[PDB]
Structures are given as structure tokens and as C-alpha cells.
Symmetry: D2
Subunit: 135 residues, 4 copies
């Protein structure tokens, strides 16, 4: 099954990437998220709306479009993630990206400074953009 | 054919009565969100200490696999429900999928129970199954 | 005397207009909770990569030192506002204190604005303070 | 410079709240942060959201229970912020760590993480076996 995926993108990244749309499409199919990402992204945008943002209705549509651009990966075993979480001092959510990223031999793209540090191979969104700009 | 959608709060209460419902597993479903919510919940208890997170997680893993997993909802639609009914995005997800899929949402959350067409709590579900 | 109770969301949008309100500072107040709520918000910024955090936190410290801090609400009363008006405990805190104290809640939360008698947003508070 | 020896956080407040008789005699030694009121409040609220027949009576017992704890002043956002960024703690947790460590108090927490990252911190069982020896 087409496994042209190279990066696992979390919500903090997904959010930043949504801004540089043009820059990364075409390069998608190389980008992936977890099922959890969708909800995290959704909740973030909901918070925006809560604190006032006449958008939301329109912003939600945009997110929906960006989201569909990504490939969604199989959920990790609650089993294994729990371990990473416990061992690396991460939350279950973060330990989820850290676990998939590694077990899948993928580069985790994240904005969270602690995840970048506790995940082998992680890079941030600015790095992803320069990488993609190259090829 | 799936009849109920079980959220994280219910999944938890249900994991305490495995035997009373495994025989009805085909009737229960969850959202991919549920795995994470359930997981993060078990993580907090591990955080607040109690030697067994590994064992406990093993058990949660077992209970989890029993449910069919529905498709993620359109972030679009969920968002409308979240705003229109005063729910979080997560809670909204369940209300949306539950209603939109024509299913009975099983939740322990009084708020979701009140704002979702047909929701019932875990005790209600167990008596329904005991009759089915 | 205090006229408004400002929450974390409002507090943030205010820091950028320090000049426009310090004259009315003793007319403004926050809850003890606010200090922690704002700090955590500033922490997530650092968490998501923000070089300042140290500097930013020092500015946030000064802005906060400008408000009066009211006594903590009775856990008793807040629970009731929270359950009844479907609000988190933290949000209900501001709702309760503002109302029971006869103050104007200044929040950016659309949900809070709608469930707190007489609450206004930061834009409004600013035009009022200007008229003052 | 007070009789306060321990800073009790929310997780602790809860554990303790069911051993009331076993420590109320030492109430003067125990303290909390203003944050604690809200954190404990929010916790109880969650039990209520998830169906807890008596959120009312319960919130009332929690009210009384907490009135016996002295309440220390809020830490300078200043210092907490640094403890957090540095120790991998949230602003909330870092607050206890800072107050406790700074005011030379013994932080009583049920959080394994905070215990680990807070100098001389202990759990409820420890506080209870200690108060007993007093
Ligand atoms: Cl953490
Ligand atoms: Cl809510």
C-alpha cells in the first residue's frame, strides 16, 4: 500500500503548516498524521472560536481541506505507547506521535520543544519547509 | 450491525463489567478518539501512582480491541455541533457521529447525555443488553 | 473601588494596551486563579518554541502586579454555577465572583460572555475606560 | 517563619480528605496554594459531570475540609516560569515545586512526577505516617 510517507505530522505542526499551504502540497503523500491529530487540530480551532473569532465556520472548512490532504496512519497499541509515555516522561498524546514516528521509521515534525528533544529524528516545521523546498 | 457508540467515560465504566457485555461486543463501537482518551485517562492514574500501569494498560488494550471503530467525523460538522450546543470539540464528535450515524450514544457525561438525541448512560446500556 | 473582574483571556489581550488602562488599574481586578491560568498560557508558548518566555514572563509579571486580587469564591457556590450553567469550574469561578460581587466580567470567552450577566469583552472595556 | 511544615497540593488534598480525623489535629502544619482551591474544585466538578449523585453535599464537605488549611501567597509568575521550563513541569505543578522548595516546606503530592522533580517531596502515606509519629 503506497507508503511514500516520510513524516509524521502532529497538531502543533499541522497548524503551522496550514499557513504555508502551497509550500507543501505535491509533497503530501509524504506527510502523515494520526487519527488523534484531527481531533487535536479541531479542538485548537474550537478554542480560537470560543475566545472570539468570527471565523470558525470558515476556518473550520479550511482546516477540513488541509486535513484531507494528509495520510492517516493506523492507531498505535495502547500497550506500547503507555510505555513510551511512562518512560520518556510524555503524555499519552505526545507518546503517541513519538511511538508511531519511531516504530514506523518516520520523521516526526512537531513544534513542541519537549517532543523534538525526546523523539529521535524529530524536526520542526521550519525545517520541514526547507527540506521540501529542496526536492 | 453496530447499535451503540461508547465514549471514553463509558468505556471506562464498562471495562469494569467485561463479562456482562463481551457477548454483545458486535453491537458496540467507538471513535479513534476513544483509544486516546481512554489511554490518556489510564496515563493519569499511572501519573498519580499505582504499580500496574503496564498490567492495567494490557487490560485496557484487551477491552479496547472488543469494539468496532467508526470513521472520523467531518471536522466541519462536529465544529457546528460544538458551537451550537455548547460542547467541546471532543464531546461534539460523539454527539455528531452518534446522531448522524443513527446510533445510541453511551456516555457517563451528564452534559453529553443531555445534549445528544437518545444518549443513555452505562447502567441503562447494561440493562438493555441483559434483555437483548 | 473595583468595577471589573478580568479573566485570563482578557488579561492577555490587555497586556498589549498597558498604556490605555493603568490609569484605571484599581478599577480592575482578577482572581488568584488568573495568575496561574496566565502563567500556564505563557508556558505553552515556551513549550511550542518561544525564545523570550523569560523576558515575556517578566513583562506578564508586571502587567499582573497591576490588578487587585479578590478573595477566592466558596468552592460551594461555584460548583453550583458550573453544574447549572454548564461551565468548567474555573469559568464558573469568574462567573460567580463577577455576579455575586456586582462587577462586570471582562472576558474574551464567547461562552462566558453569554452565561454571565453583564459580561463584556476587551474591546468594550477599552472604549469604556476611554470614556472614563 | 510559621508552623506550616507541609505544602499540600490537589492530588494530596483528595487522598487526605478521607483521613480527616488522622490529620485535622495537625491542620496548623498543613498549607495549600490558592491554586489548590480551584484544582480541587475542578476535580470534584469532573466527578459531578460524570454523574455523582451528591456533587452538592460533596462540594460542601470539600469546602469544610479545605477551610482547615492555611493558604500561602501566590508565587512570582517570574520564578515559577523558570522552574517549569527547566524541570519539564506545567506552570501549575512548577508552582508547588517552587513555593515548597523556596519556603523550605515539604511538598505533599500524590504525583510521581512532582515527587521526583521536587526536593524532599513526599506522598500522602508518608505525611500520614509522619504526623502519626507526632
Ligand atoms: Cl509534561
Ligand atoms: Cl464545557
Amino acid at each position: 500500500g503506497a507508503m511514500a510517507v516520510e513524516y509524521l505530522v502532529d497538531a502543533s505542526a499541522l497548524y503551522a503548516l496550514a499557513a504555508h499551504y502551497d509550500k507543501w502540497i505535491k509533497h503530501r503523500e509524504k506527510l502523515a498524521i494520526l487519527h488523534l491529530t484531527i481531533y487535536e487540530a479541531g479542538n485548537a480551532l474550537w478554542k480560537e472560536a470560543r475566545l472570539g473569532r468570527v471565523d470558525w465556520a470558515a476556518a473550520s472548512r479550511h482546516l477540513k481541506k488541509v486535513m484531507s490532504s494528509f495520510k492517516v496512519l493506523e492507531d498505535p497499541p495502547l500497550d506500547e505507547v503507555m510505555r513510551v509515555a511512562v518512560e520518556r516522561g510524555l503524555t499519552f498524546y505526545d507518546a503517541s506521535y513519538a511511538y508511531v514516528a519511531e516504530s514506523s521509521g518516520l520523521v516526526l515534525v512537531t513544534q513542541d520543544r519537549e517532543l523534538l528533544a525526546k523523539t529521535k529524528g524529530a524536526i520542526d516545521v521550519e525545517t520541514l519547509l526547507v527540506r521540501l523546498a529542496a526536492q
